[PDB]
């Protein structure tokens, strides 16, 4: 090894290696934002594809100036 | 012709004069070729993926084989085990000999037909001609993709050999 000023100061940030939460930890909470993101994309996708029209949002070079 | 583009010429014109894509023999041909490449990949992968470990983590997995071996270099039982589960057991080979016969039989048989196709359309027994088959209640002609194919063929017919024809029918 070879410690160094910067090296020590950063020593903490990299040390908790294999440290894991137990069981199904935060998984379920995660599986929700995940599903939320999935729906969020489908929306912005379907908006760009003009499948989901929304007065106020005009997906053309127009609506510009 | 003996050349790259010269071959495409042979093809494009052939199609126009014989409508080969619409001939059973050519289709069997592509089944054999597509299939071959397909199977070639199947075998190739199944086998390569079920090789008995005898190599290091940082050593070519190939070295695990010596020219002039007695026993096999892959688990044909593990191979069959995986492939049998992908589709379903009885739809998978376990007999290396039956596997390899199929492996050879398929392409060779298919190409045999493709060769018989060109040898057959060499006497003007061409592909199916479904031009203006489906017609409506009054007699109008209702097009099918078979017709869109005929137009593309006419373009080829009408333009190949610009100056070689002097008469109506292309009998040569």
């Amino acid at each position: 090894a070879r410690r160094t000023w910067l090296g020590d100061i950063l020593r903490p940030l990299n040390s908790e290696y294999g440290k894991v939460a137990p069981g199904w930890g935060t998984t379920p909470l995660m599986a929700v934002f995940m599903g939320l993101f999935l729906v969020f994309l489908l929306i912005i996708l379907e908006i760009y594809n003009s499948t989901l029209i929304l007065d106020g949002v005009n997906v053309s070079w127009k609506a510009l100036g | 012709p003996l050349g790259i583009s010269g071959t495409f010429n042979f093809m494009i014109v052939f199609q126009a004069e014989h409508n080969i894509l619409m001939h059973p023999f050519h289709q069997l041909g592509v089944a054999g070729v597509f299939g071959g490449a397909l199977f070639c990949a199947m075998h190739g992968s199944l086998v390569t993926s079920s090789l008995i470990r005898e190599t290091t983590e940082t050593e070519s997995a190939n070295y695990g084989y010596k020219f002039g071996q007695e026993e096999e270099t892959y688990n044909i039982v593990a191979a069959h085990g995986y492939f049998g589960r992908l589709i379903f057991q009885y739809a998978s080979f376990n007999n290396s000999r039956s596997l390899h016969f199929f492996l050879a039989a398929w392409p060779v048989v298919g190409v045999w037909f493709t060769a018989l196709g060109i040898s057959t359309m060499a006497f003007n027994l061409n592909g199916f001609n479904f031009n203006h088959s489906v017609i409506d209640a009054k007699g109008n002609v209702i097009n099918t993709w078979a017709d869109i194919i005929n137009r593309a063929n006419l373009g080829m017919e009408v333009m190949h050999e610009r100056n070689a024809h002097n008469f109506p029918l292309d009998l040569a």
Partner: protein, 37 residues
């Protein structure tokens, strides 16, 4: 606000969840009816 195509989006977003539902319902159920070891 809530335009015809917006309503349809919900109809499909709802008609979709249902399918995922009945599917995981049925599955989670039959799964828990046999698997002894």
């Amino acid at each position: 606000t809530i335009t015809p195509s917006l309503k349809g989006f919900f109809i499909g977003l709802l008609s979709g969840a249902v399918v995922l539902g009945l599917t995981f319902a049925v599955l989670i159920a039959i799964s828990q009816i046999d698997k002894v070891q």
